[PDB]
RNA sequence: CUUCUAGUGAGAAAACAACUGCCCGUACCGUAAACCGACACAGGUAGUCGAGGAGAGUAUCCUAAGGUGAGCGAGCGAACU
RNA sequence: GUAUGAGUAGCGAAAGACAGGUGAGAAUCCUGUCCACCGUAUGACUAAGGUUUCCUGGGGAAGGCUCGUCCGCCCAGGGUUAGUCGGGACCUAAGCCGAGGCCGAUAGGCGUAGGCGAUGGACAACAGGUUGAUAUUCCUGUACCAGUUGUUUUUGUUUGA
RNA sequence: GGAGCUGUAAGUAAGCUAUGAUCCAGAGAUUUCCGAAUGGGGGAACCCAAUAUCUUUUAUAGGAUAUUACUUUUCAGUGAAUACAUAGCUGAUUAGAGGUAGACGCAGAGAACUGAAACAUCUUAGUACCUGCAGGAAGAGAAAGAAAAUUCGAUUCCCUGAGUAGCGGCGAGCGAAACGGGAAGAGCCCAAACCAACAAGCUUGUUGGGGUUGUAGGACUCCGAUAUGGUAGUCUGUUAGUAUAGUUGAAGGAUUUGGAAAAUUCCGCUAAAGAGGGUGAAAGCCCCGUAGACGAAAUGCUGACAACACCUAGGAGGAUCCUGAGUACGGCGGAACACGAGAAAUUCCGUCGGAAUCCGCGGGGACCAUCCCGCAAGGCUAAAUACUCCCUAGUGACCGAUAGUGAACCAGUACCGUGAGGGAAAGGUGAAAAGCACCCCGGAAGGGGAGUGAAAUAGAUCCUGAAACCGUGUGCCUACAA
């Protein structure tokens, strides 16, 4: 997948449009991704998860990975991805510039 | 079969503990097994001199979870009674 | 089975057609006789037919 | 693992198999009790027995 | 199972001590609310034990051991069934 | 799918009453006392059949022809210990299969030897206790059948037990 | 292949993973027990054994592995009546079993309802059913032919002939073939005469050589080539491709609405890619992808190319010999041929009888003569043709949950039945569980607030939510009327 854990990322669609953030986890079998600060839903929680009030948590729901646009780590302008065989090894590469990742 | 795959596990129950306090221990066993093999198995697994062995084979017990119903697996439970002048197996 | 060892003549079927050509099914059996034949150097009693006995050509 | 297992010799392979088998016996006991935490050691041991027997059979 | 010999045969008999003895069933219902009858159905369901008084008697009435109190009730006490 | 009949027939032979208790709630559950019913059974064994309905602890969504705190219902756990009981490692009847074989459009039918097959024959245990649930099975005593090893005492060594 | 992975299936635990996981593809190993089940039995998924080695136990008992069914083929050893021997027995070998694909095709056996407005011949129909043999196709197949042309040259299948010619209680109905046009294309072996070798007992069984036919052919007698082409063969190899994993694969950002933009407006970009699908709504430019370009270690498959292997000769004579015997044919009885005994040729089955062979034999729709065509009674043979349990890629003026498979949901299930067997119903929250923390009534369920959410009259009976039906309230009317 063109998205991978440890990647600063821009969002394309949603109420959290134009926000940035990194990848906390990725679900390829759903083609979804989780992003800190984005889609922070308010979950009425029970205390069976070591939360001795039950309470109301705020946690990041997944996001569909097609609503996402990666960032150049050297430009800030968000881009699309190509795959290139550099040094024999296959890596992601920016469009709009040849920067890796 | 092989002597360690003969025995599978012990049976921790109130009746079984009451038997442990009378020096005879319960064990789940390969359903294809034999009383002499249980004897050999314990004698080789604990260096304890066995005196007697009883066996039961338990029916499959009906169960269900929602729409879906079925059977608990068959079991064979041996009861291995030891001698005096022998060790007590530690579990 | 009930078959000539040599020619293979066996039971078949046929029709009895009456004078009004009412048709009914019949068995049509060949003329087989049990005969001590020298099969492969051994004498053996075997079904066999007159059409094979006529020729000589097979011994008793 | 398979590397050192293929490096071993036959009687050593069989001794190791027997010892894994005893370990599995004891783990079945500890699992019948509440005396075990690392349950995956069970599948690891069974996996390793399989590796060893496969290597013997393929020799 | 007993006997007979044919055969086979260098080991057999008793006393004592110790040891071994596999597989399936073993719960519970069972003149029934668990079996067969679509039902917790006034039906049917092999055999054994089956006490006492009176009595020929396992008949009959009331009881013993033991087991039951019936899986909708209350009142009113009409016609009619 | 929902009406109609209609909140009607029916609620499936028979005796229960009371006090207390549990409980949100009691004709219906529990304890107890009287009362009634069965008693060649409405009792105690047990084959088949059923196949978990058994025991414990919770429950009252549904089921139970009412209710229900209860159940053969639901949920989580447990429970069936045999050298001697019954059956097989023993025997066979009726009947079945059937090497080869015979007969036969095919397919197959019959049937010998030999096997299978109890409802029968043969075959070494029984007194008590014990669990919440198992009992000639577990426990304590006292045995019995078949067999093994060893010791002791005997007698048979090839006209040979 | 390159980072999340431990299925459905949440959730908890424990853990694995660039020391390259999960995942994907090829090959190999393990592959319990039943089942043809095959050591013997048996009520399938159970039981009991024999022999050899090894193991446990002081030793028995116990355990593991291997072998042990029947029948066929060959071989060997023993060996009865019964002497020779054979049968039989035993041991080694060899190849069969059984189910699939509710489909296709050869053969055996073979219906009836029905139609004929009844019905018996006839039809349905050589259908259904059953059974056997199978193969990827089968079957048929290289003329004892079709014709009338002196001519076409192996079978099969489509069109056509033609609903013709005929058959038929001359009724109902049944119904060709050839010519012609096309698809596909291929022809080969053997017995026999004779020759060489072996053997018993001049013939006569075996091996090899020879030779396969109709303008007759071959053997046999003479003349020369040693040739020349083909193959319907081989895990002989190589080579190339292809199937089974895959990789890459261009182009957009902002305003309005709105919970969300893919919609609207703005200017753009791209196209060997505007196929399709998904993405918070309708996206050529967000994603999967598409066009296009690359790619297989390993196992298969296909086609060529070399080696091996197998076939492959020419001209005169016919002195003589051979050219498929209980066969063709005939009688009787029956079938199939479009053809129902009819004038009934042709083919086949049963039975009985019963020819000649080159101046010979069969056919040309009774049959005779003439003419023409062909040479049976021995075998094989690809292709075009039929069908799909299945695999891959797909398509639809096909269905869209009473439809479409019986089955979109754990369906041949639950359930019914002794059994064969029959045989259902049941889909949709939301973009995302964010699925209602907390408070109140209540025993709980279920409500009411709060809160998430765009929306809760979207809250598990979940999108929409008709009608019947059950209610609540309300404007008008209604207790001398049929
Ligand atoms: K009495
Ligand atoms: K009996
Ligand atoms: K009639
Ligand atoms: K063929
Ligand atoms: K699109
Ligand atoms: K004819
Ligand atoms: Mg037992
Ligand atoms: Mg009992
Ligand atoms: Mg009742
Ligand atoms: Mg009424
Ligand atoms: Mg009642
Ligand atoms: Mg009486
Ligand atoms: Mg109970
Ligand atoms: Mg009720
Ligand atoms: Mg209870
Ligand atoms: Mg028979
Ligand atoms: Mg007999
Ligand atoms: Mg067997
Ligand atoms: Mg008719
Ligand atoms: Mg035609
Ligand atoms: Mg692209
Ligand atoms: Mg859409
Ligand atoms: Mg646009
Ligand atoms: Mg003729
Ligand atoms: Mg004839
Ligand atoms: Mg349907
Ligand atoms: Mg609908
Ligand atoms: Mg009036
Ligand atoms: Mg009025």
Automatic annotation (TrEMBL), chain A:
Q: Which GO terms describe its cellular component?
A: ribonucleoprotein complex; ribosome
Any Pfam family the entry gives: KOW
The record's annotation in InterPro entries points to: KOW, Rib_uL2_dom2, Ribosomal_uL24, Ribosomal_uL24_C, Ribosomal_uL24_CS, Ribosomal_uL24_KOW, Translation_prot_SH3-like_sf
Q: Quick check: keyword Ribonucleoprotein in the entry?
A: yes
One annotated GO molecular function is: structural constituent of ribosome
Keywords of this entry = Ribonucleoprotein, Ribosomal protein, RNA-binding, rRNA-binding
From what superkingdom does this record's organism come?
Bacteria
GO process terms (BP): translation
Domain KOW: from-to ranges: 2-29
Keyword check for Acetylation: no
Tell me the subunit arrangement.
Part of the 50S ribosomal subunit.
- Role this protein plays: One of the proteins that surrounds the polypeptide exit tunnel on the outside of the subunit. One of two assembly initiator proteins, it binds directly to the 5'-end of the 23S rRNA, where it nucleates assembly of the 50S subunit.
Q: Which family does it belong to?
A: Belongs to the universal ribosomal protein uL24 family.
This one is known as: Large ribosomal subunit protein uL24
Organism, scientific name: Enterococcus faecalis
From TrEMBL, chain B:
Instruction: State any GO CC term.
Output: ribosome
**Tree of life domain:** Bacteria
Any Pfam family: Ribosomal_L23
Q: Which GO terms describe its biological process?
A: translation
Its keywords, alphabetically, are: Ribonucleoprotein, Ribosomal protein, RNA-binding, rRNA-binding
User: Signal peptide span per the entry?
Assistant: none
Report a single Gene Ontology molecular function: rRNA binding
InterPro entries named in the record: Nucleotide-bd_a/b_plait_sf, Ribosomal_uL23-like, Ribosomal_uL23/eL15/eS24_sf, Ribosomal_uL23_CS
* Subunit annotation: Part of the 50S ribosomal subunit. Contacts protein L29, and trigger factor when it is bound to the ribosome.
The similarity comment for this entry is:
Belongs to the universal ribosomal protein uL23 family.
Q: What does this protein do?
A: One of the early assembly proteins it binds 23S rRNA. One of the proteins that surrounds the polypeptide exit tunnel on the outside of the ribosome. Forms the main docking site for trigger factor binding to the ribosome.
Stated name of the protein: Large ribosomal subunit protein uL23
TrEMBL record, chain C:
Q: What is this protein called?
A: Large ribosomal subunit protein bL28
Q: Where is the composition biased (Polar residues)?
A: 9-25
Query: Which keywords fit this entry according to its UniProt record?
Result: Ribonucleoprotein, Ribosomal protein
Query: Can you list the GO cellular component terms from the UniProt entry?
Result: ribonucleoprotein complex; ribosome
List the lineage, top down: Bacteria, Bacillati, Bacillota, Bacilli, Lactobacillales
User: Gene3D superfamilies from the entry?
Assistant: Ribosomal protein L28/L24 (2.30.170.40)
Task: Outline the segment boundaries, as ranges, of region: Disordered.
Answer: 1-27
Q: Mind listing the GO biological process terms from this record?
A: translation
Could you confirm whether the keyword Protein biosynthesis appears in this record?
no
Q: Does the keyword Mitochondrion apply?
A: no
Q: Name one Pfam family in it.
A: Ribosomal_L28
- NCBIfam families to which the protein is assigned, alphabetical: L28
Q: Which GO terms describe its molecular function?
A: structural constituent of ribosome
Sequence similarity: Belongs to the bacterial ribosomal protein bL28 family.
Automatic annotation (TrEMBL), chain D:
Q: Which InterPro entries match?
A: Ribosomal_protein_uL29 (IPR050063), Ribosomal_uL29 (IPR001854), Ribosomal_uL29_CS (IPR018254), Ribosomal_uL29_sf (IPR036049)
Which Pfam families does this one have? Ribosomal_L29
Give the record's keywords alphabetically.
Answer: Ribonucleoprotein, Ribosomal protein
Q: Name one GO molecular function term.
A: structural constituent of ribosome
What family classification does the UniProt entry report for this protein?
A: Belongs to the universal ribosomal protein uL29 family.
What the entry lists under NCBIfam families is as follows: L29 (TIGR00012)
The protein's name in its UniProt record: Large ribosomal subunit protein uL29
Q: Which organism is it from?
A: Enterococcus faecalis (Streptococcus faecalis)
Q: Which gene encodes it?
A: rpmC
């Amino acid at each position: 997948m063109f998205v991978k854990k440890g990647d600063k990322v821009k969002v394309i669609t949603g109420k959290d449009k134009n926000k940035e953030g990194v990848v906390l986890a990725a679900f390829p079998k759903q083609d979804k991704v989780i992003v800190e600060g984005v889609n922070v839903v308010k979950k009425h929680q029970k205390p069976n998860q070591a939360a001795p009030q039950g309470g109301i948590l705020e946690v990041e729901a997944p996001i569909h990975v097609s609503n996402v646009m990666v960032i150049d780590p050297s430009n800030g302008e968000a881009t699309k991805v190509a795959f290139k065989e550099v040094d024999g090894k296959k890596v992601r590469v920016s469009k709009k510039t040849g920067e890796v990742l | 079969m092989e002597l360690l795959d003969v025995i599978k596990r012990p049976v921790i129950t109130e009746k079984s503990m009451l038997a442990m306090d009378e020096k005879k221990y319960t064990f789940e066993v390969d359903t294809r097994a034999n009383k002499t093999l249980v004897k050999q198995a314990v004698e080789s697994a604990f260096d304890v001199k066995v005196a007697n062995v009883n066996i039961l084979n338990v029916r499959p017990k009906f169960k269900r979870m929602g729409k879906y119903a079925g059977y608990t697996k068959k079991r064979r439970k041996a009861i291995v009674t030891l001698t005096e002048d022998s060790k007590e197996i530690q579990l | 089975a009930k078959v000539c060892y040599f020619t293979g003549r066996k039971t078949s079927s046929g029709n009895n057609r009456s004078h009004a050509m009412n048709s009914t099914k019949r068995t049509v059996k060949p003329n087989l006789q049990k005969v001590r034949v020298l099969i492969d150097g051994k004498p053996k009693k075997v079904w066999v037919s007159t059409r094979a006995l006529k020729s000589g050509k097979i011994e008793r | 693992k398979v590397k050192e297992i293929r490096e071993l010799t036959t009687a050593e392979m069989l001794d190791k198999e027997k010892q894994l088998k005893e370990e599995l016996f004891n783990l079945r006991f500890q699992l019948a009790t509440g005396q075990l935490e690392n349950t995956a050691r069970i599948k690891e041991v069974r996996q390793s027995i399989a590796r060893i027997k496969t290597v013997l059979r393929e020799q």
